[PDB]
């Protein structure tokens, strides 16, 4: 662990240093502007990608919903729908004939 | 050490908020095929004065502003039509 | 014992390896979040070449899966908006509809019993 | 002995990070206030391009404006109960076609 931690904190000190001199060279001198793409016009953004999650979100509860609709009126068919056919005929025979022998008692 | 570790952390996680799935773009759409309803068209063909939805593809190529505008009529027409329904109030219970 | 046990644990804030371990994978976490930002300069400074351009707008690809999500979710409406219609027009959304299926599960029910 | 031993040792280790740390810190500052800025000055509502891009902006702008009205009057419902509800009928409809095939 102490071996580790040294060369860990070498790194990061490496890092350190790099991150120093990127933003001297680089990131800062392009922060370096006077109008830094002013800050005002920061705000202005508060209604473009916030509002279209929200609307994702809408959207994704709507068909939700409407999905939810459609398979409730899928077994509204299925409950109505009498799914229970009795066999037929040869079978609603064959039935009564076991509820004659059930009413022999 | 503490210190600055509560003074990194935040700006660190909305760093984590932007540099976090760099990596994604759009797909082809051409393949989408068209079987418009026919009361659509009945609509667009009621209110010419009022309705200013263009194609939805003009030059061969798709148009924003028309398909959002055909679906926010779409959902102006869900909206008359469920406000003459009368209900208001929608509850269910999962643990029955 | 007593006096070697007090001074073992007076020193447990820094000594003992094991907040040297929780701090270590704390500098394992900000070593990795600072090496996958730093691994992407040229696409970073990129982006600090993007200011408030209003004839060319400069989209980025963190919304790129956003705007195909809505786009799909626009074209499974324009897909099958007359089931849609259908479905709202014959009965209620979980109303009439919630209602007959607890009284129509009884007869299953009822006819497991027999 | 042994503690002066390990406490000279975590100086050398926590002493050249002391001094770089300010200007590191303060740096970081600056540079997450100019990320903060370019996050909130990416402005994304575009296809191929109609018109203006500008122009084309504003126009699905005020579109979505609209859109969050009508939104806002109109928002009822969520997402994953319903995903739940779907599943277990989709398994009473197994239940059921085995059921009839068991009687």
Same mark, same amino acid.
């Given at each position: ?105 | ?6 003074? =990194?952390?935040?700006?660190? &996680?909305?760093?984590?908020?932007? !540099?976090?799935?760099? #990596?994604? $773009?759009?797909?082809?759409?051409? +393949? ?7 009361? =659509?068209?009945?609509?667009? &063909?009621?209110?010419?004065?009022? !309705?200013?939805?263009? #194609?939805? $593809?003009?030059?061969?190529?798709? +148009? ?33 | ?114 | ?103």
């Amino acid at each position: 662990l102490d071996q580790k931690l040294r060369l860990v904190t070498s790194d990061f000190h490496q890092l350190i240093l790099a991150f120093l001199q990127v933003y001297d060279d680089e990131l800062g001198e392009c922060c370096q502007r006077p109008g830094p793409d002013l800050h005002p016009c920061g705000p202005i953004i508060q209604a473009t990608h916030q509002n279209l999650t929200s609307y994702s979100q809408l959207l994704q509860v709507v068909m939700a919903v409407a999905d939810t609709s459609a398979k409730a009126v899928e077994t509204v068919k299925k409950q109505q729908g009498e799914q229970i056919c009795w066999g037929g005929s040869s079978s609603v025979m064959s039935l009564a004939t076991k509820m004659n022998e059930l009413m022999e008692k | 050490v503490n210190e600055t570790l509560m003074f =990194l952390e935040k700006e660190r &996680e909305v760093v984590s908020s932007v !540099l976090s799935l760099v #990596n994604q $773009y759009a797909l082809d759409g051409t +393949n989408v095929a068209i079987n418009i309803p026919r009361l =659509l068209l009945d609509k667009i &063909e009621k209110q010419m004065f009022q !309705l200013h939805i263009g #194609n939805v $593809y003009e030059a061969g190529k798709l +148009n924003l502003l028309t398909v959002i505008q055909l679906l926010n009529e779409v959902l102006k027409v869900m909206k008359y039509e469920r406000c003459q329904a009368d209900q208001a109030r929608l509850t269910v219970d999962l643990h029955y | 014992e007593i006096e070697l046990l007090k001074l073992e644990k007076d020193t447990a804030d820094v000594v003992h390896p094991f907040f040297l371990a929780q701090k270590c994978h704390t500098l394992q976490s900000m070593n990795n979040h600072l090496e996958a930002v730093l691994k992407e300069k040229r696409s970073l400074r990129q982006r600090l070449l993007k200011p408030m351009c209003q004839e060319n707008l400069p989209i980025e690809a963190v919304y790129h899966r956003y705007m195909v999500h809505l786009l799909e979710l626009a074209v499974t409406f324009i897909e099958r908006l007359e089931t849609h219609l259908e479905t709202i027009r014959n009965i209620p959304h979980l109303a009439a509809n919630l209602k007959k299926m607890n009284q129509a599960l009884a007869k299953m029910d009822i006819l497991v019993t027999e | 002995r042994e503690l002066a031993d390990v406490l000279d040792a975590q100086i050398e280790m926590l002493s050249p990070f002391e001094a770089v740390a300010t200007r590191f810190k303060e740096q970081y500052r600056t540079f997450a206030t100019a990320l903060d800025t370019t996050r909130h000055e990416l402005p994304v509502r575009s296809i191929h391009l109609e018109g203006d891009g500008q122009q084309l902006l504003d126009a699905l702008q005020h579109e979505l404006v609209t859109t969050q009205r009508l939104l806002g009057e109109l928002d009822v419902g969520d997402s994953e109960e319903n995903v739940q509800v779907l599943d277990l009928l989709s398994e009473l409809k197994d239940v059921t076609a085995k059921k009839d095939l068991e009687l």
